[PDB]
Structures are given as structure tokens and as C-alpha cells.
From Swiss-Prot, chain A:
This is A-type voltage-gated potassium channel KCND2. Homotetramer or heterotetramer with KCND1 or KCND3. Associates with the regulatory subunits KCNIP2, KCNIP3 and KCNIP4. Interacts with the regulatory subunit KCNIP1; this interaction mediates the capture of both the N- and C-terminus of KCND2, preventing N-type inactivation and stabilizing the S6 conformation, thereby accelerating closed state inactivation and recovery. In vivo, probably exists as heteromeric complex containing variable proportions of KCND1, KCND2, KCND3, KCNIP1, KCNIP2, KCNIP3, KCNIP4, DPP6 and DPP10. The transient neuronal A-type potassium current called I(SA) is triggered at membrane potentials that are below the threshold for action potentials. It inactivates rapidly and recovers rapidly from inactivation. It regulates the firing of action potentials and plays a role in synaptic integration and plasticity. Potassium channels containing KCND2 account for about 80% of the neuronal A-type potassium current. In contrast, the potassium channel responsible for the cardiac I(to) current differs between species; it is mediated by KCND2 in rodents. Is specifically and reversibly inhibited by the scorpion toxin Ts8 (AC P69940). It is found in: Cell membrane; Cell projection, Dendrite; Synapse; Perikaryon. Detected in ovary, in corpus luteum and in granulosa and theca cells in the follicle (at protein level). Highly expressed throughout the brain. Detected in amygdala, caudate nucleus, cerebellum, hippocampus, substantia nigra and thalamus. Expression is not detectable or very low in heart, kidney, liver, lung, pancreas and skeletal muscle. Not detectable in human heart atrium. Phosphorylated by MAPK in response to signaling via the metabotropic glutamate receptor GRM5. Voltage-gated potassium channel that mediates transmembrane potassium transport in excitable membranes, primarily in the brain. Mediates the major part of the dendritic A-type current I(SA) in brain neurons. This current is activated at membrane potentials that are below the threshold for action potentials. Belongs to the potassium channel family. D (Shal) (TC 1.A.1.2) subfamily. Kv4.2/KCND2 sub-subfamily.
Swiss-Prot record, chain B:
Genetic variation in DPP6 may influence susceptibility to amyotrophic lateral sclerosis (ALS). ALS is a severely disabling and lethal disorder caused by progressive degeneration of motor neurons in the brain, spinal cord and brainstem. The chain crosses the membrane at residues 4-24. This is A-type potassium channel modulatory protein DPP6. It comes from the Eukaryota. It is found in: Cell membrane. The gene is DPP6. The lineage of its organism: Eukaryota, Metazoa, Chordata, Craniata, Vertebrata. Promotes cell surface expression of the potassium channel KCND2. Modulates the activity and gating characteristics of the potassium channel KCND2. Has no dipeptidyl aminopeptidase activity. The chain holds residues 93 to 143 of 865 of the full protein.
Length: 44, 51
């Protein structure tokens, strides 16, 4: 039961993916997810 | 969410027209068959070649 409830808790920390604004790695992550910007989706 | 797809369509058709243009440009082929019968043995004695 505890490993089950820890399994549903490990992904609960999905908060770092929040608000081409910080650096080159920022636009990198921008087109890594093809729904963040219009450029990402069109490129994908 | 459709106009972005329209921009994608226009950029892809630009790329496709570039591809078609280079397809018609780079291989400037020309066959030039010029299919005329090769000189045969009797030709030397044919009246046409009789100088």
C-alpha cells in the first residue's frame, strides 16, 4: 500500500515545468514539448 | 489552433515548391536519340556513297 501511495506521490512534484525567456536551454525545453509555443508545434 | 496549421501548410508548400524547382533545375537531362541506322557492309558500294 505504501509503495502504491508513493508511486502516486513521486510525480506529484511536477511543478518545475512552470512559467526563449531564460536561455538557450529555455527554448530547447520549449520545443522539447510541442505544445508550449507556436514555433514548437509547427516545427514538430 | 487552426491558423498555426495554416502557417505550417504555407511553409511546407514553400519547401515543396523549392524541392520541385530543384528537381527541374539540377538534372538538366537531354537524350538526343538521333536514331539513324549505322553504316552497313553494303553502304560502301551503295550508289549514295558513289563519289
Amino acid at each position: 500500500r505504501r509503495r502504491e501511495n508513493a508511486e502516486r506521490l513521486q510525480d506529484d512534484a511536477d511543478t518545475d515545468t512552470a512559467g526563449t525567456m531564460t536561455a538557450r536551454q529555455r527554448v530547447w525545453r520549449a520545443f522539447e514539448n510541442p505544445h508550449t509555443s507556436t514555433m514548437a508545434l509547427v516545427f514538430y | 489552433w487552426k491558423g498555426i496549421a495554416i502557417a505550417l501548410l504555407v511553409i511546407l508548400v514553400i519547401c515543396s515548391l523549392i524541392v520541385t524547382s530543384v528537381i527541374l533545375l539540377t538534372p538538366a537531362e537531354d537524350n538526343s536519340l538521333s536514331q539513324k541506322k549505322k553504316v552497313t557492309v553494303e553502304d560502301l558500294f551503295s550508289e549514295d556513297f558513289k563519289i
